[PDB]
Amino acid sequence: QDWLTFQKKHITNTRDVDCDNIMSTNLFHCKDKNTFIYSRPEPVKAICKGIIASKNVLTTSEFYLSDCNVTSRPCKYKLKKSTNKFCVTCENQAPVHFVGVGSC
Amino acid sequence: QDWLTFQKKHITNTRDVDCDNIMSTNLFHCKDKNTFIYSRPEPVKAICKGIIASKNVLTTSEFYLSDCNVTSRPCKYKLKKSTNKFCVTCENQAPVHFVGVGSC
């Protein structure tokens, strides 16, 4: 019925994560914090290429990150946008856990 | 705990729309079908450039489409991925309705 509503209904992609709306979904259930990587999966998965054992691996390059951080208002967030290295648990050559931004 | 959950929780430029998470939110309210355009808003907006009067317009060019379809289980979805032209209602140079895939 309008452009912004069409966008929300039918367009899957913005670097600008809508924190209040995505953090309130079933998957995030209003938790205090989540980091989103604006990237294709393949370059993220490549971080763990050739790693079989469970290991924490910092990226050798930076990615575009959206951090949703809760305010004093329940399930209301502020968005921080940055580029940085991040750390993942690699297992069977795939990321299984996001460990942290800038450092393991 | 695994690469699929990692993707759902932290990767934000995917063609794999998380149907089960998104289709339950207020805008979709567990409806049986929704088509998502794997794109940023600008090239989608551009379809309706200089189209003023309410008008159904098929794209002259293909986009990546991710169709969430309900399974035999209510508000549980399969994802069908394709490239195709699609049809929109344009008004005031913005798409306001998704009319269908491949045809108006």
Swiss-Prot record, chains A, B:
Instruction: Give the EC class as a word.
Output: hydrolase
* Pfam short name (any one): RnaseA
Pyrrolidone carboxylic acid: residues carrying this PTM: 1
One GO biological process term is: defense response to Gram-positive bacterium
Question: What SMART domains does the record point to?
Answer: RNAse_Pc
Q: Which domain of life is it from?
A: Eukaryota
Q: Which InterPro entries match?
A: RNaseA, RNaseA-like_dom_sf, RNaseA_AS, RNaseA_domain
Record GO terms (molecular function): endonuclease activity; nucleic acid binding; RNA nuclease activity
Which residues constitute the catalytic centre?
Answer: 10, 97
Signal peptide coordinates: none
Instruction: Report disulfide bridges, numbered on this chain.
Output: 19-68, 30-75, 48-90, 87-104
Cross-referenced Gene3D superfamilies: Ribonuclease A-like domain
Function as written in the Swiss-Prot or TrEMBL entry? Basic protein with antiproliferative/cytotoxic activity against several tumor cell lines in vitro, as well as antitumor in vivo. It exhibits a ribonuclease-like activity against high molecular weight ribosomal RNA.
Write out the similarity annotation: Belongs to the pancreatic ribonuclease family.
Q: What is this protein called?
A: Protein P-30
Species:
Lithobates pipiens (Northern leopard frog)
The taxonomic lineage of its organism, from the top, reads:
Eukaryota, Metazoa, Chordata, Craniata, Vertebrata
